[PDB]
């Protein structure tokens, strides 16, 4: 979810910097990251990847490194089929389906399996699923003929130069993701990567819904080459970035605009307040050091309090209810940082839930709407303050219910707890503006909550000679029953005390503990 790459020119020492900061569930298994370092006579790579992957997706070495963020590349389309006479209406007539008879075994509970017949129907578009409501949906997924995904990342992260890196990138074997890049040679790059069907008509929201499946009018067959996709290289701004925002402000002096690409590639929706902070933290700072770069990554600002408390608060002070009045003074006194000691933050999240929806995205409410012309400051103000205040009222009840008081310290309700380690939390929801994210869970009956998702692997690398890199894994490097490497780094994360990442033999030779010779 967060990615930053800065060019020598914007740094103090003259060496490019990279931020690897993916945000994912702390529990779903295929999303678990693991950190490793592989060294061979011909290559070397350090980084994190999702368990089960033979190659490192977030990697770096002495020469270069890359990082990813979800871009949501629309690589499949779901067609609503018009069923009729045992086939589907398509163009002029009824076409019969391709039918394969498959079958699978089902574990019983008594240890036995039973055969389960499974009939796979396919329209010319792709396989057919019947939704619970009866809609027959055929899924057409792009890139099914791209066998080389793993090797692509592999030849990509072991590239000898940008030029060699982009050639690998160019094979279009990796179907999604924004991928950011950086060199000890100084080039930095941002690519809206993915496999995207070439289409003749349609806004991206059109392609994300049920496209009609009655016409070859909507059956694409080709996909875009890398050079048809949004990309930025060594921009005038001296940095690139992506925090899941659409690809329209990847660097600040921007280098292209939504008019320059097919409208089905990426949306043109408001950028996250976290995305907006990403651009401000980068553009507004110069002569960056690894240290300041790392300080900036910890940013935990309640950007949405900055966009609303000005109108909100005086409105609330004139409320008759003494408690609403007292809520507004607690809010007015807040430095607007989701810090552990903050007594106003919880109360504010709860107001923002109502004012901006359960996921805090949600623009109704603001007085002046979002705009690409002021991409980093526009969703702003409160439209109907009286409404907003009745929301603050409801929110006080909520906060009280959920946490037992409206002024409980943020870090006493928000906890990071792994095994028997229980440390205070800081930072929070990305959509409220916090750059460092911890999507807190709902509270248990003691008002304690933990992160459901957010910071997982976090590394920052300066491409000096030798390379210098620091990082941390929220949920340690193993969740196998009984390791001492699950709850291992959480208290470090609570203090933002990063470990130096060791790539040099001498540093490895010295930190050795646990050791295994093999021969294959």
């Amino acid at each position: 979810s967060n990615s930053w790459a800065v060019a020598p020119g914007k740094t103090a020492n003259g060496n490019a910097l990279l931020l690897q900061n993916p945000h994912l569930s702390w529990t779903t298994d295929y999303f678990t990251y693991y950190e490793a370092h592989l060294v061979t006579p011909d290559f070397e790579i350090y980084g994190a990847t999702q368990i089960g992957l033979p190659v490192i997706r977030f990697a770096f070495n002495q020469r270069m490194g890359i990082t990813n963020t979800v871009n949501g590349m629309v690589g499949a389309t779901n067609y609503r089929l018009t069923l009729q006479d045992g086939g589907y209406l398509y163009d002029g007539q009824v076409r019969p389906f391709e039918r394969r008879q498959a079958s699978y075994r089902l574990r019983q509970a008594d240890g036995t399996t039973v055969d389960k017949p499974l009939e796979i129907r396919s329209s010319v578009h792709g396989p057919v699923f019947e939704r619970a409501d009866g809609t027959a949906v055929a899924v057409r997924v792009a890139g099914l003929d791209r066998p080389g995904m793993l090797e692509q990342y592999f030849d990509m992260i072991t590239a000898d130069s940008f030029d060699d890196y982009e050639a690998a990138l160019a094979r279009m074997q990796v179907p999604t993701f924004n991928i950011v890049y950086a060199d000890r040679e100084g080039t930095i790059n941002y690519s809206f990567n993915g496999v995207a069907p070439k289409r003749a008509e349609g806004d991206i929201a059109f392609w994300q819904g049920l496209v009609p499946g009655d016409s070859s009018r909507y059956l694409w067959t080709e996909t875009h080459p890398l050079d048809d996709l949004p990309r930025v290289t060594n921009p005038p701004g001296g940095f690139v970035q992506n925090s899941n925002d659409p690809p329209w402000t990847p660097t600040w002096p921007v280098t292209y605009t939504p008019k320059d690409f097919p409208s089905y590639l990426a949306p043109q929706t408001p950028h996250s307040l976290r995305a907006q902070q990403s651009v401000r933290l980068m553009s507004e700072n110069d002569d960056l050091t690894l240290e300041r770069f790392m300080a900036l990554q910890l940013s935990h600002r309640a950007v949405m309090a900055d966009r609303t408390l000005p109108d909100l608060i005086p409105a609330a002070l004139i409320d008759p209810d003494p408690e609403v009045q007292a809520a507004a003074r607690l809010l007015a006194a807040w430095d607007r940082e989701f810090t552990s000691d903050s007594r106003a933050a919880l109360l504010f999240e709860e107001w923002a839930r109502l004012f901006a929806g359960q996921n805090f995205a949600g623009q109704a409410g603001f007085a002046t709407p979002w705009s690409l012309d002021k991409p980093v400051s526009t969703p702003y103000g409160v439209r109907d303050p009286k409404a907003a205040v009745d929301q603050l009222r409801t929110a006080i009840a909520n906060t009280k219910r959920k946490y037992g008081a409206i002024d409980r310290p943020f870090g006493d309700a928000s906890r990071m707890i792994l095994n028997d380690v229980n440390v205070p939390g800081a930072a929070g929801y990305g959509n409220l503006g916090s750059f460092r994210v911890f999507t807190w869970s709902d509270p248990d009956e003691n008002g304690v909550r933990t992160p459901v998702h957010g910071e997982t692997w976090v590394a920052m690398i300066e491409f000096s000679t030798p390379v210098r890199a620091y990082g941390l894994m929220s949920y340690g490097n193993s969740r196998q029953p009984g390791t001492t490497h699950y709850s291992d780094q959480i208290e470090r994360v609570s203090r933002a005390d990063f470990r130096e990442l060791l790539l040099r033999r001498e540093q490895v030779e010295a930190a050795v503990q646990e050791r295994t010779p093999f021969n294959f």
Binding site: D29, Y30, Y34, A36, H37, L38, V39, T40, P41, Q50, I51, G52, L53, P54, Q62, G75, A76, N78, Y104, R105, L106, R107, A109, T113, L118, I120, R131, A132, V137, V139, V141, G143, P147, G148, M149, L150, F154, P175, T465, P466, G476, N477, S478, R479, Q480, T483, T484, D488, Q489, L502, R504, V508, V512, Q513, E514, R515, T516, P517, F518, F520
Partner: protein, 153 residues
């Protein structure tokens, strides 16, 4: 000015960190991918074997009903069979890094059958194709084409 001298491993070994991080040194690529495979089985063995089991479309059969929907989802989109193809379609150099990775998971299990869970032992002999299949599932049928999306659910 050129980067610092690359280290040339002279024997295969994994030097593990104080935080459970493996530094895998291999005299050649395939060896590194095996050490890597061993490392992962050591640190996340159980879920990797469960994941691979699901990518063969064997979820319902190894573990039952709670795993049936992913199974129907993966067979209907023919993921297990396409993973067999993608594996045959790899270049030889890379197919060997993949087989090396599968061989490491396996070696770890055989040498550490205890440091490994009962429900997933049945999966065990894993293969380069299992590796390719999970990645295919992850990339195309989790990231790109998710079941909640086409299924509506």
């Amino acid at each position: 000015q050129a980067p610092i001298a690359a280290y040339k491993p002279r024997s295969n070994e994994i030097l593990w960190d104080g935080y459970g991080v493996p530094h895998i040194y291999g005299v050649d690529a395939p060896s590194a991918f095996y050490g890597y495979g061993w490392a992962q089985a050591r640190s996340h063995g159980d879920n990797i074997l469960r994941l691979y089991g699901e990518a063969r479309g064997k979820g319902a059969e190894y573990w039952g009903p709670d795993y049936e929907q992913t199974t129907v989802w993966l067979l209907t989109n023919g993921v297990p069979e396409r993973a067999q193809q993608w594996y045959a379609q790899q270049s030889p150099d890379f197919r060997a890094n993949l087989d090396a990775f599968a061989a490491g998971i396996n070696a770890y299990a055989q040498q550490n059958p205890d440091d490994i869970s009962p429900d997933v032992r049945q999966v065990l002999p894993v293969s380069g194709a299992d590796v390719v299949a999970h990645a295919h599932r992850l990339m195309n049928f989790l990231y790109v084409a998710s079941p909640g999306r086409t299924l509506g659910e």
